[PDB]
Design a protein around this nucleic acid. Structure first.
Ligand SMILES: Nc1nc2c(ncn2[C@@H]2O[C@H](COP(=O)(O)O)[C@@H](O)[C@H]2O)c(=O)[nH]1
Ligand SMILES: Nc1nc2c(ncn2[C@@H]2O[C@H](COP(=O)(O)O)[C@@H](O)[C@H]2O)c(=O)[nH]1
Ligand SMILES: Nc1nc2c(ncn2[C@@H]2O[C@H](COP(=O)(O)O)[C@@H](O)[C@H]2O)c(=O)[nH]1
Ligand SMILES: Nc1ncnc2c1ncn2[C@@H]1O[C@H](COP(=O)(O)O)[C@@H](O)[C@H]1O
Ligand SMILES: Nc1ncnc2c1ncn2[C@@H]1O[C@H](COP(=O)(O)O)[C@@H](O)[C@H]1O
Ligand SMILES: Nc1ncnc2c1ncn2[C@@H]1O[C@H](COP(=O)(O)O)[C@@H](O)[C@H]1O
Ligand SMILES: Nc1ncnc2c1ncn2[C@@H]1O[C@H](COP(=O)(O)O)[C@@H](O)[C@H]1O
Ligand SMILES: Nc1ncnc2c1ncn2[C@@H]1O[C@H](COP(=O)(O)O)[C@@H](O)[C@H]1O
Ligand SMILES: Nc1ncnc2c1ncn2[C@@H]1O[C@H](COP(=O)(O)O)[C@@H](O)[C@H]1O
Ligand SMILES: Nc1ncnc2c1ncn2[C@@H]1O[C@H](COP(=O)(O)O)[C@@H](O)[C@H]1O
Ligand SMILES: Nc1ncnc2c1ncn2[C@@H]1O[C@H](COP(=O)(O)O)[C@@H](O)[C@H]1O
Ligand SMILES: Nc1ncnc2c1ncn2[C@@H]1O[C@H](COP(=O)(O)O)[C@@H](O)[C@H]1O
Ligand SMILES: Nc1ncnc2c1ncn2[C@@H]1O[C@H](COP(=O)(O)O)[C@@H](O)[C@H]1O
Ligand SMILES: Nc1ccn([C@@H]2O[C@H](COP(=O)(O)O)[C@@H](O)[C@H]2O)c(=O)n1
Ligand SMILES: Nc1ccn([C@@H]2O[C@H](COP(=O)(O)O)[C@@H](O)[C@H]2O)c(=O)n1
Ligand SMILES: Nc1ccn([C@@H]2O[C@H](COP(=O)(O)O)[C@@H](O)[C@H]2O)c(=O)n1
Ligand SMILES: Nc1ccn([C@@H]2O[C@H](COP(=O)(O)O)[C@@H](O)[C@H]2O)c(=O)n1
Ligand SMILES: Nc1ccn([C@@H]2O[C@H](COP(=O)(O)O)[C@@H](O)[C@H]2O)c(=O)n1
Ligand SMILES: Nc1ccn([C@@H]2O[C@H](COP(=O)(O)O)[C@@H](O)[C@H]2O)c(=O)n1
Ligand SMILES: O=c1ccn([C@@H]2O[C@H](COP(=O)(O)O)[C@@H](O)[C@H]2O)c(=O)[nH]1
Ligand SMILES: O=c1ccn([C@@H]2O[C@H](COP(=O)(O)O)[C@@H](O)[C@H]2O)c(=O)[nH]1
Ligand SMILES: O=c1ccn([C@@H]2O[C@H](COP(=O)(O)O)[C@@H](O)[C@H]2O)c(=O)[nH]1
Ligand SMILES: O=c1ccn([C@@H]2O[C@H](COP(=O)(O)O)[C@@H](O)[C@H]2O)c(=O)[nH]1
Ligand SMILES: O=c1ccn([C@@H]2O[C@H](COP(=O)(O)O)[C@@H](O)[C@H]2O)c(=O)[nH]1
Ligand SMILES: O=c1ccn([C@@H]2O[C@H](COP(=O)(O)O)[C@@H](O)[C@H]2O)c(=O)[nH]1
Ligand SMILES: O=c1ccn([C@@H]2O[C@H](COP(=O)(O)O)[C@@H](O)[C@H]2O)c(=O)[nH]1
Ligand SMILES: O=c1ccn([C@@H]2O[C@H](COP(=O)(O)O)[C@@H](O)[C@H]2O)c(=O)[nH]1
Ligand SMILES: O=c1ccn([C@@H]2O[C@H](COP(=O)(O)O)[C@@H](O)[C@H]2O)c(=O)[nH]1
Ligand SMILES: O=c1ccn([C@@H]2O[C@H](COP(=O)(O)O)[C@@H](O)[C@H]2O)c(=O)[nH]1
Ligand SMILES: [Mg+2]
Ligand SMILES: [Zn+2]
Lengths: 304, 48, 115, 217, 108, 152
RNA sequence: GCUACCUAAGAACAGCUAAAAGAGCACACCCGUCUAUGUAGCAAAAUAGUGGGAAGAUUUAUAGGUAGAGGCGACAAACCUA
């Protein structure tokens, strides 16, 4: 007999558990708002060859952004909700060549997760997260499990690797899944309009692996590479990312610094372990900008 | 001030009260005829 | 946009431009890697049995936002060397031609109006 | 009171925090220049700097035929057939190359989209470029002029005779004949205007927007 | 297309006996508190719903009796009343329909 | 792809979906509880919820009368919409309907459902009433909200 | 009793333009140009649209007649119970 959390509760105990467990989520989220006044791991400066932990954000949508050369740059919104680091995995047992950290975001219901998953967060003292991503790091950057991660971890002018599951399209055919040309409509052509043509040759008595034939579109993890941050809203935790991000609106992404050789070495000015708001030195404004962006509130741009 | 629709059957439904309105829209055409020859035509046009 | 054999209009004070009878010039080529021709693209043009190079100045196709979307596909005529055929241009011409690559300073000295 | 269309969020599954962040950048731009009440029948003179010249301004006058675009990239498209030739510029409302926008004649036509003026006569769409703005009245109703246009013959750009467009700005009767009045009424589709879930009931949403507007001042 | 060679007893034996083609054992099932006929979760009782609808039948039978014929519908809210009862002062001024059985224990 | 679309396509077309919900909503104003399949109840359920919202605009509204000639197939339920159902849900702002799932039909084994207007002349349908406050799990957690009330 | 032709005595052919037209448009009807569906199909030859004729060398009901070294044929060496 499959159960759920709310199977035997009366109408007098349904609002209590709705209030109490959500207050437990808000208490543990507000107990973890001080990384530096707790005991952290040591801070190290940036070195050539060092990598940094990323974030998990939600894609709100896009608004247009205009630059001082007078061209429109579409910018997607990448809003970071409740980003905490959950686990550290060392150099020796990481099954790779870089070490890793695990980070989760989008706190979800504690009633709708497996008991093996819930014992992880119950040790940490955190609400359970929706999606857990693993970031390759070096040993220079190592952050204790439990610190919050904010939007000002990144900075404007920084190029960013973003990946998520793309919009699934179900079982699709030929001219939509792979963009082939198909057959003409009229001039004979009785039942061939969106049909795959020849698959292989005659001497091949089979079909090769990896041939393009109808199957399920989308719902795979794709990465877009080299996307500039133009702007950061610190108040609502917004990353303003250039172009389009894989996935639908209100979806969870993986926000990593770029892999591109020209765009992966320039990391001197970036705050290296994370960004810590408890440092209390030069508190960041409402909105951090790039050089080329137009300020909403700056006057009309005159090119003379 | 509130013009309610009048409570009748519909002309196109398949029932017995909708049949009786379809009888009356025939019986409106007998009332609206000009000559007696037009009345005698539509009163005896459907051979049953 | 302008593919092969669209009907366009020549906006020039030429003696070759005021064509009687079949008063609709038909293009035969676009000088791009696509068939698609935009504002400031060379095309060929067949006028009165004579094939002639031409330059797209505004089209009926919606392009970028603050650029005009002219209700007639109007095209100026040039020869192979690059200067225009005519002496005056009376139609409006967009000012998007200056930045774009090509012999377009020849055209903008002929336009009477810049809208 | 007039609430401009772009402040209304389109029906969708977008998070309302996206449109709250959008409305902050809408209202900071509106401090720079004044955006007047301009309708679909309004005539506007828009001055814009552009990066194509050496830094001059361009004043383009036109009829604001179509005012869609729902967000920070709100657009409006103007028409002029100056020197006998049609000019069609889609002006983005919040682009920072605009300096000032003003209305010449603040009026409204019977139709929500004047895209049919492409297929109308050019006499009903030409406008004097150096013409003075009309004197405005402070608190009265906006003027609606029933200036139902006459068109060119049957091969139009779009099938405006169909009732899916719902055009109420054509004198249809003298340019189109009665048999192809009836054939266009075959696409009447009378169930749409009686419907409930294809009607986006937006009355509650303006209360939060107007709360946001006046709290920004 | 036609089969080049016939499908044998073993290949059918695996295919029509797969757990995907085998029907699933459902765990959706409870016993009703009131009547005792075993119901399912997330649906109503088949016995209790047939109890109400067959009780609804003689109630709606009498609605057609007090009008007689079509296109005659009340403009007043209505209360059903069983035997051994009086109309209340809230029930004064309604169309009160009477079916001659005792008041059922599930009706309130 | 139907990401987006909330309209089940039914009937023999988009005209025929409207008329089949028009007929189904009308029996919900006369009999005030009806039986229909899941795709036909839940399509019609929103139109039943906004029937009363358009019936609370008043007797004298032209628009509430012009949709009433369409959306009620019969013409004598037009008084019943504006004078029985509308003053009954006068205080309420939403949720005037009650949709519950019925055991399946004998013919096509259809996932059928019962829909009514909340409060009626009819006998009460056996709506699923949940567990009492006197059980083992309630009384253990009644001590939770009784202890934590004294923590202020 | 299908069909090819024939005999007997019958029937049908709106409206429109024109006048006594194997005339024009166009129904009912007759035929089957092209396409699509269908191809163990609804159908051992159909359906939907588009088409040809539709007062005539027309179409059609009924009864009769010609029978295989034959009949019949505005010859397709077609048709004569798939
Ligand atoms: N019933 C239903 N199933 C869906 C829908 N979208 C996705 N699915 C299911 O999820 C699978 C994968 O979809 P993604 O969009 O790739 C589909 O093949 C289907 O089984 C939907 O709208 N309705
Ligand atoms: N249908 C079809 N036509 C073919 C084929 N091979 C050649 N053709 C030729 O193609 C042309 C068009 O035939 P379809 O009916 O469209 C005809 O001339 C026909 O002879 C084939 O395999 N199928
Ligand atoms: N799949 C495929 N096979 C081809 C093509 N052209 C040739 N072949 C192969 O080459 C053989 C001989 O080609 P010829 O052009 O007939 C074919 O039988 C086929 O196997 C092609 O365009 N596609
Ligand atoms: N309405 C729906 N019903 C069932 N599965 C759905 C669904 N909407 C989304 N999904 C699932 O979520 C995946 C991602 O959604 P979308 O296609 O981006 C889909 O491929 C499908 O597996
Ligand atoms: N493997 C499979 N077996 C059966 N039905 C399938 C199927 N894959 C897809 N479908 C059908 O297609 C619908 C959508 O699947 P998805 O978008 O590929 C399913 O709800 C089902 O009706
Ligand atoms: N089974 C087969 N029967 C006849 N010809 C065949 C054949 N398989 C291939 N061919 C012919 O052999 C040639 C080589 O083509 P390949 O086998 O795809 C072609 O002419 C092809 O048509
Ligand atoms: N249904 C199918 N369609 C296409 N190719 C197939 C096929 N079934 C088998 N094959 C071909 O035969 C090969 C061997 O498959 P087998 O089931 O082990 C495949 O890799 C493929 O090339
Ligand atoms: N092989 C080819 N491919 C494409 N276009 C060609 C061509 N040969 C000629 N043309 C077109 O025809 C025009 C006239 O050339 P003609 O040989 O003079 C060329 O400028 C080019 O546009
Ligand atoms: N990066 C690139 N590599 C190759 N061809 C390109 C290219 N960018 C543009 N092109 C060519 O120029 C054409 C016009 O593209 P533009 O971005 O509108 C393209 O269709 C293609 O032929
Ligand atoms: N302009 C448009 N035309 C058609 N479908 C649209 C649309 N905008 C949105 N949709 C539909 O709605 C889905 C999500 O957008 P909507 O804001 O819920 C899309 O995936 C698409 O199915
Ligand atoms: N694919 C696209 N390319 C260019 N501009 C676009 C666009 N999608 C939207 N826009 C801009 O955004 C406006 C509408 O905003 P959003 O899509 O609600 C459009 O009028 C246009 O200015
Ligand atoms: N071109 C083809 N080649 C081989 N098998 C085919 C085929 N087309 C259909 N079949 C097979 O014939 C069987 C019946 O066809 P139906 O479309 O389900 C199926 O097993 C199918 O896979
Ligand atoms: N929280 C969310 N906000 C917006 N779109 C979402 C979403 N979750 C899923 N989607 C989108 O909606 C689709 C499913 O549509 P639904 O069944 O109407 C998904 O495939 C995805 O593209
Ligand atoms: N043909 C496409 C596909 C995607 N996109 C962009 O890419 C984003 C992510 O799409 P993916 O298929 O998940 C979309 O939201 C859209 O902005 C596009 O602009 N054009
Ligand atoms: N049942 C199958 C198996 C293979 N295939 C095709 O044959 C290819 C090679 O598969 P083999 O089993 O290695 C696949 O990638 C697929 O394209 C198929 O279409 N259907
Ligand atoms: N085909 C395309 C075009 C643009 N884009 C995205 O849109 C952004 C803006 O491109 P525009 O062509 O200026 C790109 O930087 C890229 O992120 C894309 O993903 N795919
Ligand atoms: N119940 C809903 C959900 C979405 N929508 C909107 O409609 C769009 C697509 O459907 P159209 O209204 O046909 C969605 O993207 C969303 O904006 C709606 O109208 N009703
Ligand atoms: N998705 C979009 C949206 C707009 N556009 C362009 O932008 C113009 C303004 O549209 P807005 O949505 O108001 C359109 O007329 C079209 O030219 C586009 O090409 N693609
Ligand atoms: N909120 C609910 C309600 C019912 N259920 C029941 O549990 C069944 C699913 O259990 P299994 O994990 O498949 C549902 O079909 C329903 O009977 C549930 O899990 N959660
Ligand atoms: O190519 C694009 C995509 C979106 N946008 C902007 O982003 C907004 C996102 O809208 P959607 O419906 O999520 C859109 O309304 C435009 O303002 C562009 O300007 N260009
Ligand atoms: O199986 C599930 C999971 C979630 N939900 C609903 O989604 C809500 C949020 O779940 P998440 O995992 O945070 C939850 O409180 C329920 O209302 C279900 O109804 N069923
Ligand atoms: O840990 C929890 C549990 C429930 N909830 C919310 O409580 C509501 C009901 O919980 P569910 O059925 O899991 C729903 O709105 C959830 O999002 C939380 O936000 N956090
Ligand atoms: O021009 C060609 C020739 C063959 N083919 C494919 O190759 C197959 C074998 O062709 P061969 O001529 O035997 C044929 O069935 C097609 O699938 C093409 O697609 N195009
Ligand atoms: O155009 C061609 C010709 C041959 N082939 C291959 O080469 C094989 C031998 O072709 P030849 O023409 O004999 C043939 O069986 C195919 O596998 C192609 O794939 N494409
Ligand atoms: O049984 C199968 C095997 C492959 N496929 C399709 O063929 C594609 C290539 O498969 P291979 O094994 O590489 C795969 O992505 C599917 O779209 C099927 O649809 N069914
Ligand atoms: O023909 C092909 C198709 C894909 N691939 C690669 O295989 C991987 C898996 O793609 P899919 O799942 O078939 C991916 O890395 C592709 O680039 C090939 O190597 N060859
Ligand atoms: O056609 C395109 C354009 C951009 N992109 C990706 O988007 C990134 C940003 O491009 P923009 O045009 O600035 C680029 O670096 C690529 O990763 C594509 O993949 N394809
Ligand atoms: O039009 C484009 C742009 C980028 N890309 C890919 O994206 C990569 C990053 O491009 P960006 O513009 O930095 C580039 O190296 C290509 O692999 C394309 O394939 N096409
Ligand atoms: O071309 C074919 C098609 C089917 N079959 C046989 O028919 C069986 C079922 O056909 P399908 O999958 O519907 C398959 O498993 C084969 O045994 C063939 O042998 N050849
Ligand atoms: Mg067009
Ligand atoms: Zn029961």
């Amino acid at each position: 007999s499959g159960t759920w959390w709310d199977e035997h509760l009366s109408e007098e105990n349904v609002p209590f558990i709705k209030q109490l467990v959500s207050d437990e989520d808000k208490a543990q989220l507000a107990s973890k708002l001080c990384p530096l006044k707790d005991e952290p791991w040591p801070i190290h400066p940036w070195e050539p060859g060092s990598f940094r932990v990323g974030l998990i954000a939600l894609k709100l949508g896009m608004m247009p952004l205009w630059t001082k050369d007078g061209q429109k740059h579409v910018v997607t919104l990448l809003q970071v909700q409740d980003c905490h680091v959950l686990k550290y995995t060392s150099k020796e047992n990481c099954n790779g060549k870089m070490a890793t950290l695990s980070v989760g975001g989008k706190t979800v219901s504690r009633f709708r997760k497996a008991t093996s998953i819930l014992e992880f967060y119950r040790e940490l003292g955190l609400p359970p997260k929706q999606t857990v991503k693993i970031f390759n790091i070096t040993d220079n950057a190592a952050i204790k499990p439990g610190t919050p991660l904010y939007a000002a971890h990144f900075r404007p002018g920084q190029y960013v690797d973003v990946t998520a599951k793309t919009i699934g399209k179900g079982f699709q055919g030929v001219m939509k899944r792979w963009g082939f040309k198909g057959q003409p409509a009229t001039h004979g052509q009785t039942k061939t309009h969106r049909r795959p043509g020849a698959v292989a040759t005659g001497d091949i008595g089979r079909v090769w692996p990896g041939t393009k034939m109808p199957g399920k579109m989308g719902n795979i993890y794709r990465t877009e590479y080299g996307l500039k941050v133009w702007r950061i809203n610190t108040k609502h935790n917004i990353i303003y990312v250039n172009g389009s991000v894989p996935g639908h609106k209100n979806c969870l992404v993986k926000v990593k610094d770029s892999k591109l050789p020209a765009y992966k070495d320039l990391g001197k000015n970036l705050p290296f372990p994370t960004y810590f708001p408890d440092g209390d030195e030069e508190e960041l404004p409402e909105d951090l900008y790039d050089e080329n962006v137009c300020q909403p509130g700056a006057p009309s741009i005159t090119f003379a | 001030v509130a013009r309610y629709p009048p409570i009748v059957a519909s002309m196109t439904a398949d029932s017995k009260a909708a049949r009786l309105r379809r009888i009356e829209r025939w019986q409106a055409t007998v009332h609206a005829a000009e000559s007696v020859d037009e009345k005698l035509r539509i009163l005896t046009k459907m051979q049953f | 946009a302008i593919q092969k054999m669209t009907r366009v209009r020549v906006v020039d004070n030429s003696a070759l431009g005021n064509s009687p009878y079949h008063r609709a010039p038909r293009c035969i080529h676009v000088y791009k890697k696509n068939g698609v021709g935009k504002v400031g693209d060379q095309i060929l043009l067949a006028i009165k049995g004579q094939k002639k190079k031409a330059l797209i100045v505004g089209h009926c196709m919606p392009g970028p936002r603050m650029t005009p979307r002219f209700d007639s596909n109007n095209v100026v005529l040039i020869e192979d060397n690059g200067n225009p055929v005519g002496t005056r241009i009376k139609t409006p011409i967009p000012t998007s031609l200056r930045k774009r690559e090509g012999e377009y300073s020849k055209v903008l000295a002929i336009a009477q109006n810049f809208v | 009171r007039f609430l401009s269309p772009e402040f209304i969020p389109r029906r969708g599954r977008t998070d309302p925090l996206k449109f709250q962040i959008e409305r902050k950048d809408m209202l900071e731009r509106r401090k720079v220049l004044h955006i007047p009440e301009f309708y679909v029948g309004s005539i506007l003179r828009v001055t814009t700097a552009d990066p194509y010249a050496s830094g001059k301004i361009s004043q383009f006058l036109g009829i604001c035929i179509q005012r869609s675009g729902r967000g920070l990239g709100a657009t409006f498209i103007l028409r002029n057939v100056i020197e006998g030739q049609g000019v069609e510029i889609c002006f983005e409302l919040y682009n920072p190359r605009v300096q000032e926008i003003q209305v010449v004649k603040l009026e409204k036509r019977l139709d929500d989209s004047l895209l049919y003026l492409r297929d109308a006569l050019p006499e009903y769409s030409t406008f004097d470029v150096n013409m003075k703005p009309v004197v405005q009245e402070p608190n009265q109703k906006v003027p609606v002029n029933e200036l139902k246009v006459k068109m060119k013959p049957k091969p139009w750009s779009k099938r405006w005779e169909r009732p899916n467009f719902n055009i109420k700005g054509i004198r249809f009767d003298l340019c189109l004949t009665e048999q192809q009045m009836k054939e266009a009424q075959k696409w009447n589709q009378p169930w749409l205007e009686f419907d409930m879930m294809r009607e986006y009931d937006t009355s509650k949403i303006e209360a939060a927007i107007w709360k946001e507007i006046e709290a920004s001042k | 297309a036609a089969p080049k060679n016939r499908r044998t007893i073993e290949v059918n034996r695996c295919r029509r006996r797969n757990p995907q083609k085998l029907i699933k054992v459902k765990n959706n099932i409870d016993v009703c508190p009131e009547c005792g006929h075993l119901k399912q979760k997330h649906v109503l009782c088949a016995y209790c719903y047939e109890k109400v609808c067959k009780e609804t039948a003689e109630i709606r039978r009498q609605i057609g009796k007090q009008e007689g014929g079509p296109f005659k519908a009340p403009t007043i809210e209505t209360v059903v009343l069983y035997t051994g009862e009086t109309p209340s002062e809230q029930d004064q001024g309604k169309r009160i329909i009477e079916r001659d059985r005792k008041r059922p224990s599930w009706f309130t | 792809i139907s990401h987006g679309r909330v309209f089940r396509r039914m009937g023999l077309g988009p005209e025929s979906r409207i008329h089949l919900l028009r007929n189904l909503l009308t029996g919900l104003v006369r009999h005030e509880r009806i039986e229909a399949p899941w795709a036909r109840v839940d399509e019609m359920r929103g139109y039943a919820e906004k029937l009363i919202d358009y019936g609370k605009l008043g007797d004298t509204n032209e628009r509430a009368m012009r949709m009433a000639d369409f959306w009620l197939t019969e013409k004598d339920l037009i008084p019943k919409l504006f004078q029985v159902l509308a003053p009954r849900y006068k205080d309420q702002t939403g949720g005037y309907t009650r949709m519950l799932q019925i055991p399946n039909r004998s013919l096509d084994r259809a996932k059928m459902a019962v829909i009514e207007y909340k409060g009626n002349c009819l006998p009460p349908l056996p709506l699923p009433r949940r567990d009492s406050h006197l059980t083992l799990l309630n009384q253990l957690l009644q001590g939770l909200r009784q202890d934590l009330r004294q923590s202020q």
